[PDB]
Design a protein around this ligand. Structure first.
Ligand SMILES: O[C@@H]1[C@@H](O)[C@H](O[C@@H]2CO[C@@H](O[C@@H]3CO[C@@H](O[C@@H]4CO[C@@H](O)[C@H](O)[C@H]4O)[C@H](O)[C@H]3O)[C@H](O)[C@H]2O)OC[C@H]1O
Ligand SMILES: [Ca+2]
Length: 161
């Protein structure tokens, strides 16, 4: 148990948007609970809730990340991805991204996204590693309504292996 977010305290914490989207801890919508993190006002596939997690982890280790996600408007099914944003040498202009997991969700039902991930070693110069959720990438030219639907995440956990 290295990191846990259940949002039951109502606090956004260090969770942030990636662009112009809106994040809000809502009540009355949750995974077997009353609170969760809603992301809305998405206008890119890459808009989604993100949190910095490097400080919780040991560089050079393997950890297990999971979370639950739900959407309740738009298409009948939609893919949601779990991804990592990585910063090296404190160079904010040259960020990297990787999908670590993907599942197809049915409208209105909660489902788990999970995978092992590798935390790069110290000698890489890694300086940020942030987990986030999104829909499949993208492209601004081609982004649609179904791609940018609002969605909920809950019960985010990272664990040792
Ligand atoms: O292996 C490939 C993967 O690397 C790739 O991952 C996608 C890479 O693009 C990601 O979208 C990025 C997200 O960051 C945006 O920058 C923001 C916009 O400017 C400011 O508002 C803000 O400060 C920045 O954070 C960037 O514009 C956008 O392109 C996407 O989420 C990843 O899924 O996927 C394809 C694989 O082949
Ligand atoms: Ca919750």
């Amino acid at each position: 148990a290295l990191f846990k977010a259940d949002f039951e305290d109502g606090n956004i914490g260090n969770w942030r948007a990636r662009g112009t989207e809106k994040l809000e801890v809502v009540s009355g919508i949750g995974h077997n609970s009353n609170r969760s993190l809603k992301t809305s006002s998405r206008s890119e596939t890459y808009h989604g809730p993100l949190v910095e997690v490097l400080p919780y982890l040991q560089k050079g280790s393997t950890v297990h990340i999971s979370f639950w996600a739900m959407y309740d408007e738009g298409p009948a099914t939609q893919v949601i991805n779990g991804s990592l944003e990585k910063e090296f040498n404190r160079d904010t202009a040259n960020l990297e991204y990787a999908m670590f997991a993907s599942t197809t969700l049915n409208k209105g039902q909660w489902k788990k996204i999970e995978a092992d991930i590798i935390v790069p070693a110290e000698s890489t110069g890694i300086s940020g590693l942030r987990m986030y959720a999104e829909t499949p990438w993208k492209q601004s030219s081609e982004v649609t309504e179904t791609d940018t639907i609002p969605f909920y995440v809950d019960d985010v956990q990272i664990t040792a292996t």
